[PDB]
Design a protein around this nucleic acid. Structure first.
Length: 279
DNA sequence: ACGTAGGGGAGAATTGG
RNA sequence: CUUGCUCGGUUCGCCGAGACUCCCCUACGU
DNA sequence: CCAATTC
């Protein structure tokens, strides 16, 4: 199950103000700093509505309007597994000590866990919120158009030589001999690997011209949690199914992300979300 | 600032109002 | 083989050559 | 139609 990465196009509000992130951060901030007696007392979290509904009342963790069951089970199983990770580490670090031969516990005089886990900013998606083809009617308004999910996707730049002179993608005459006779990736005109600062490049970088060219031919997929929608560029998905030999040139969007899981993992600060290959 | 070293993590197929 | 990314040619129009198991967090060397 | 239940 190898990973594939996708760039983000637009979102209404940033991922910090998302209730799914705020609830996770609030839950994580409350749990890591708990004594070994508090984790067992407060570990009475189930996989049911009524179990989680009152768990916030007893523990007092803020709720920012997040009540979805599976979303809560993706930030409560994980938070207690990170908590157990430090104790298991010093217990597996106890295991190496045991092999060599009181102990090196993970609780100080205050009783708290001294090597407190850091807050994990990953926002884990679930089945009820999965990427779908961006339909202009159902989903909110965005400038970039959405493709039909049933029609096959276009093949990128066929017959590169047969491109008008003076129009983007033109291969000059002195350069047509000694071209790649073997198959490789076909980089686009607006590719940044052709336009970047190099001692030998006299060309001018203009980020406005290139980036606008990039999203007109984009492949948008959308994930909506509450009243927040994130829209992406499903071309890293397309390249992943191309350089790996699992796909052909003509392939529909509905079938493109069927290769991937319905649970993307987002990176709020880096601006990238990672897919995986469902097997 | 950097290897390292070592804990966490990366669905989906029914069922019920 | 439409994005992204590393290393090179270049007539600056784009070309050839690559990588693709990654993110988070706590620690310890230089 | 889509969260809660479930492994």
């Amino acid at each position: 199950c190898p990973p594939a990465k996708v760039n983000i196009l637009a979102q209404s509000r940033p991922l910090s103000e998302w209730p799914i992130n705020l609830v996770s951060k609030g839950v994580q901030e409350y749990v890591y700093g708990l004594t070994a007696a508090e984790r067992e007392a407060n570990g009475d979290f189930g996989t049911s509505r009524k179990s989680l509904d009152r768990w916030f009342a007893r523990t007092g963790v803020p709720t920012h309007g997040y009540t979805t069951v599976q979303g809560l089970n993706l930030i409560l199983r994980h938070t207690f597994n990170r908590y157990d990770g430090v104790i298991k580490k010093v217990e597996t670090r106890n295991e190496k000590r045991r092999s060599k031969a009181p102990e090196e516990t993970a609780f100080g005089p205050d009783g708290k866990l001294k090597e407190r886990p850091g807050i994990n900013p990953s926002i884990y998606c679930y089945q009820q919120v999965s990427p779908v083809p961006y339909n202009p009617a159902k989903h909110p308004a965005l400038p970039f158009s959405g493709v039909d999910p049933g029609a096959p996707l276009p093949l990128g730049t066929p017959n590169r030589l047969s491109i008008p002179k003076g129009q983007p993608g033109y291969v000059p005459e002195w350069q047509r001999p000694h071209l790649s006779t073997k198959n490789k990736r076909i980089r686009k005109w607006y590719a940044r690997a052709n336009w970047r600062r190099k001692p030998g490049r006299k060309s001018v970088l203009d980020e406005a011209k290139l980036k606008e060219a990039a999203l007109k031919e984009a492949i948008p997929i959308i994930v909506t949690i509450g009243k927040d929608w994130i829209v992406m560029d499903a071309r890293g998905l397309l390249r992943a199914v191309y350089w790996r030999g699992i796909a052909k040139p003509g392939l529909s969007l509905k079938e493109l992300l069927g290769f991937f899981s319905g649970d993307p993992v987002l990176d709020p600060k880096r601006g990238i979300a990672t897919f995986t290959f469902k097997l």
